[PDB]
Every structure is written in structure tokens, then in C-alpha cells.
């Protein structure tokens, strides 16, 4: 009887593992069909191109039910092949200074779908093994580089609103590169062009929005500002309260 009892529970154990494996077989058959559907639709040969909203749905379905497939496979490489060409086209006409919010929700949606669970807090320079860090670096960063060269720091507001709306979304390592290497020399350069005695737009109106994002980093720039304002105060008289206001 104990032999029959042990085998019976073991037989039920085989059914609980036959039923489970069969479910994944039906699931992975869909997984293969979805990847083959994607590969077909991404070709110019297919008159039904894969829309970016549908590609998110595919990645959502693969992550939620089919999760084990992402953990074992090269989730980076799958994103590089599929997500990166489509994201390039979606941002191709994007002007971050005119519409700072375009693509914020989508990339945040993609952040949940592509950034590896260990790495969302770090945001480090993983161009080797993260699907999102190299996404923002290869797709999103080229458009930003061009615009910063064109951007005028006196009109900082579209650029401040852009960086603040994306600060929670983009990798931290990308942010530091933008602030130190691209934004900071231009902010200095704009101060070099700004003249306190002839410019009608007060410097605080366009430097102070950078106080949250940059904080301590703005300290070297205050000396040129103080020096030009020193030149402005040369003709100022204490009865003129406008210096106190500025």
C-alpha cells in the first residue's frame, strides 16, 4: 500500500508538472509567434508595420506572463534590434524645447519594460548589459546634443522643463554628462554675452531655474556674474532700489 501511496502522490506530482509544462509550451509557442510576427512586420516587405504602441504591448505581454524568457535571454539585444529603430523614428521629429512632454510617458513605460531591475536606481554607464541605458544614449541623446548647441540659456525655461520632466526617467549617468560638459560651458558663454546694463531680462529669471538640478555646480559661474554686476553697480547710486530687487 505504501508503494501504491507513494507512487499515487508521485503520479499527481507528474500531472502537476505535466499541466504546468504544457501551459508554458502553449505560452512559448505564442512567444515564438510574437517574435516571428515582429521580425516580419519590421521588414519593409510587410505592409503592416509594427506600431510603437503595439511593440510596447508585445513587451508588456512578454514581461508579465512569459517573464522567464527575458531573464534567460539577451533582453538588451532584443531591445537593440526591435525597440531602437522604432524609437529613432518616433523621436525623429521631436523638438524637446517645443514639446518637452512628448515621449516622456512612452520612455517611462519603456523604462519599466527595458531597464533591468537591479539598475533603475543606479542609472550607471552600462552600455554593455542594460537595454535602457544604451537606448537613451544611442536614440535619445543625439537629438539632445544638437539642440543644446542651438539652445540659448536666456530662454532657459524650455530646457529646464525638458530636463526636469526627464530627470526621473533618464539614466543618472547621462544627466551628469549633459550638465557638466554641455550645459555648463554654454551658461558661462551666455553670461559672457549678457550685459547687465543693457539687457532687459534679469539674470535670475534664467539662472535660478537651474538651482534644483545643478545646485553646487553653479558656484564657478557666480564669479563672472558678480564681476559683470560689479561693472553695472559702478554707475548705480544707493537711491536706486532696483539693484536690491535684482
Amino acid at each position: 500500500r505504501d508503494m501504491v501511496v507513494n507512487l499515487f502522490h508521485e503520479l499527481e506530482k507528474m500531472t502537476e508538472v505535466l499541466d504546468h509544462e504544457e501551459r508554458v509550451i502553449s505560452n512559448l509557442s505564442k512567444v515564438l509567434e510574437m517574435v516571428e510576427e515582429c521580425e516580419r512586420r519590421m521588414q519593409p516587405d510587410c505592409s503592416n508595420p509594427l506600431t510603437l504602441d503595439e511593440c510596447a504591448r508585445i513587451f508588456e505581454t512578454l514581461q508579465d506572463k512569459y517573464y522567464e524568457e527575458y531573464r534567460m535571454s539577451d533582453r538588451v539585444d532584443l531591445a537593440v534590434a526591435i525597440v531602437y529603430p522604432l524609437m529613432k523614428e518616433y523621436f525623429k521629429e521631436w523638438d524637446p524645447l517645443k514639446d518637452c512632454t512628448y515621449g516622456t510617458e512612452i520612455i517611462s513605460k519603456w523604462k519599466s519594460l527595458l531597464e533591468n531591475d537591479q539598475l533603475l536606481s543606479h542609472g550607471g554607464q552600462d552600455l554593455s548589459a542594460d537595454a535602457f541605458h544604451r537606448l537613451i544614449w544611442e536614440v535619445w541623446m543625439p537629438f539632445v546634443r544638437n539642440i543644446v548647441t542651438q539652445w540659448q540659456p536666456r530662454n532657459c525655461d524650455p530646457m529646464v522643463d525638458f530636463l526636469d520632466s526627464w530627470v526621473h526617467i533618464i539614466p543618472v549617468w547621462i544627466l551628469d554628462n549633459i550638465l557638466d560638459q554641455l550645459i555648463f560651458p554654454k551658461l558661462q558663454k551666455e553670461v559672457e554675452n549678457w550685459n547687465p546694463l543693457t539687457d532687459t531680462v534679469p539674470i535670475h529669471s534664467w539662472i535660478h531655474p537651474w538651482l534644483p538640478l545643478m545646485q553646487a555646480r553653479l558656484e564657478p559661474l557666480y564669479s563672472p556674474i558678480r564681476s559683470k554686476l560689479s561693472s553695472a553697480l559702478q554707475k548705480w547710486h544707493p537711491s536706486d532700489s532696483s539693484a536690491k530687487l535684482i
Partner: protein, 48 residues
């Protein structure tokens, strides 16, 4: 796309092979009980 697509093809057939193995073991374990079940009934009938 083919890098992930390769692994998905192989894994699906492998799970079927694992399913097939479990299916065959289910049949063999069923057979083992039958020969034991006969001995139970034979012992029970003789016990009365």
C-alpha cells in the same frame, strides 16, 4: 532578432521532450501500482 528567436525555438521543443519524459514516467508508475494493487487484493482476500 534572430539571437533571442534561436533560444525560443530550442527551448520550446526541449520543454516538449521534458513533458514527453514526464508523460512516459507517468505511464510506467501507473503500471507499477497495478501489479502492487493485485497483491493488495490477494492479501486482503486471504486475510479474511
Amino acid at each position: 532578432i534572430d539571437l533571442v528567436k534561436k533560444q525560443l525555438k530550442d527551448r520550446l521543443d526541449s520543454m516538449k521532450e521534458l513533458h514527453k519524459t514526464n508523460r512516459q514516467q507517468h505511464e510506467k508508475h501507473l503500471q507499477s501500482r497495478v501489479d502492487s494493487t493485485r497483491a493488495i487484493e490477494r492479501l486482503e482476500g486471504s486475510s479474511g
